[PDB]
Amino acid sequence: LELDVHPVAGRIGAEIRGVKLSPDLDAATVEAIQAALVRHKVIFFRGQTHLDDQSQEGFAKLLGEPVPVVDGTRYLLQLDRANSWHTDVTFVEAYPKASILRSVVAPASGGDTVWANTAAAYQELPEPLRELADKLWAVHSNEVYETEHPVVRVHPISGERALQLGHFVKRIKGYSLADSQHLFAVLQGHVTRLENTVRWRWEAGDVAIWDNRATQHYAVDDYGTQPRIVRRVTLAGEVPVGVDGQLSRTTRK
Ligand SMILES: O=C(O)CCC(=O)C(=O)O
Numbered sequence: 001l002e003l004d005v006h007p008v009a010g011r012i013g014a015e016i017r018g019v020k021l022s023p024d025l026d027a028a029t030v031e032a033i034q035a036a037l038v039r040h041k042v043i044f045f046r047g048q049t050h051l052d053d054q055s056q057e058g059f060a061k062l063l064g065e066p067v068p069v070v071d072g073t074r075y076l077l078q079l080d081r082a083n084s085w086h087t088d089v090t091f092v093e094a095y096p097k098a099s100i101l102r103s104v105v106a107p108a109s110g111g112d113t114v115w116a117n118t119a120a121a122y123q124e125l126p127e128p129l130r131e132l133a134d135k136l137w138a139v140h141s142n143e144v145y146e147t148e149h150p151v152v153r154v155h156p157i158s159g160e161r162a163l164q165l166g167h168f169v170k171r172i173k174g175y176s177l178a179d180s181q182h183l184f185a186v187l188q189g190h191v192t193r194l195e196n197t198v199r200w201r202w203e204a205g206d207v208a209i210w211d212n213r214a215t216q217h218y219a220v221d222d223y224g225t226q227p228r229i230v231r232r233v234t235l236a237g238e239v240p241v242g243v244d245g246q247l248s249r250t251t252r253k
């Protein structure tokens with residue numbers, strides 16, 4: 001089955017048209033959504049005005065296992081300011097594989113979200129720099145969790161390698177602070193290079209789904225006191241596997 005798919009930016013992002021999200025989508029549609037997701041890293045559905053809290057949660061269960069919630073859902077989180085580049089929850093070992101985020105109230109101006117393609121960012125590194133990234137490990141922390149992840153993760157479905165960095169990174173293991181800072185700045189600078197990102201301007205009823213294994217994202221905080229309300233379901237992810245087959249591991253509480 002071929003969905004009606006319209007790429008947004010050149011290296012990440014696609015709008016999918018003609019699909020009404022619901023718990024009742026057939027297997028072919030769900031499979032084609034999962035494929036578009038792995039390929040485009042973040043996908044968008046507009047005009048999902050029929051999707052309510054329960055229906056978002058039921059749709060999400062088709063994609064994976066959902067992990068103070070919106071009444072009465074079990075898993076639906078309300079957010080109403082993440083203006084830092086990050087991959088969700090990387091201070092834990094098995095961080096989410098995806099989120100499904102719906103716009104409930106969208107500011108008339110401002111309020112965008114930006115995603116970065118961390119697999120494209122890895123691939124564009126000159127070979128000796130990829131080889132270096134293949135060997136590095138970083139400590140990610142919420143400061144109380146600390147987890148050591150490889151800097152390069154081999155995606156469990158696509159096999160594409162992706163940089164695992166972002167705001168939760170405390171330091172690159174085995175380096176002085178200064179070296180850690182330079183090396184992070186180089187690799188993270190490839191992630192957020194404009195060519196590797198797509199920016200979405202939200203309208204009420206927009207839903208975005210992103211592959212948290214191969215992206216980072218940033219919520220633009222330019223909308224002042226204009227209300228902004230989004231609702232999110234997050235899907236359980238796997239323990240990252242590095243290029244040499246080694247696994248992430250939690251090192252503190
Ligand atoms: O508010 C957004 O647009 C994204 C917020 C965020 O980082 C998340 O929900 O994981």
Ligand SMILES: [Fe+2]
Nearest residue numbers: 082087088217
């Ligand atoms: Fe986030």
